[PDB]
Amino acid sequence: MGPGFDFAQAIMKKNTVIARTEKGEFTMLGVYDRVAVIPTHASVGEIIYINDVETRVLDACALRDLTDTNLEITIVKLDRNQKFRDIRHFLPRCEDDYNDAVLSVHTSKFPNMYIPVGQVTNYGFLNLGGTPTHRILMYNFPTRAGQCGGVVTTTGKVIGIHVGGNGAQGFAAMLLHSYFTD
Numbered sequence: 001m002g003p004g005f006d007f008a009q010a011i012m013k014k015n016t017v018i019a020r021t022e023k024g025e026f027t028m029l030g031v032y033d034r035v036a037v038i039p040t041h042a043s044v045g046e047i048i049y050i051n052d053v054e055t056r057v058l059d060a061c062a063l064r065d066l067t068d069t070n071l072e073i074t075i076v077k078l079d080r081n082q083k084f085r086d087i088r089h090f091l092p093r094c095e096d097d098y099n100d101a102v103l104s105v106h107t108s109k110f111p112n113m114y115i116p117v118g119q120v121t122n123y124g125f126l127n128l129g130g131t132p133t134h135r136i137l138m139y140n141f142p143t144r145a146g147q148c149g150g151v152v153t154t155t156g157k158v159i160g161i162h163v164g165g166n167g168a169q170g171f172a173a174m175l176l177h178s179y180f181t182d
């Protein structure tokens, strides 16, 4: 509907797939080559469904910071016959706060969904479902089941993936450029 939505749509139309694990259907962001991300609570195994196609998982790594604290991001390399557009140059280098973000979701339950969430706080520590978690972004929107994996963008930056909420606030795990050096 405006320039934030333009950037979000451009990411959704080329850099997402629908991922299915035994724990549900998730928006999945493809970052480059056959490398994507998903919330760690998706519990990715040796096989995952990608747009309802049985796909071998070549590697899955549940990220933790150097204090050995959960970051809630799992990086997955997919045995897929097609590469993603490389969007690593849209990833922030540092932890930050943002204005005027959009949360975008694409699943069977919520197709073509876009939410203007407003201001994004560098929240930091969150007890996420009992699990101490770091590098959390917060926005004051009442997010719901079905939005985990959703992509958080500003104009020109892909800043996080949605991982939870408390009924009044939503929480995303940061994406940083340093996660996807090769």
Ligand SMILES: O=C(O)c1ccnn1C1CCOCC1
Residues within 6 Å of the ligand: 006, 007, 010, 011, 155, 156, 157
């Ligand atoms: O997919 C894209 O490149 C796209 C769509 C809208 N804006 N962008 C980019 C253009 C260069 O600055 C960063 C954002």
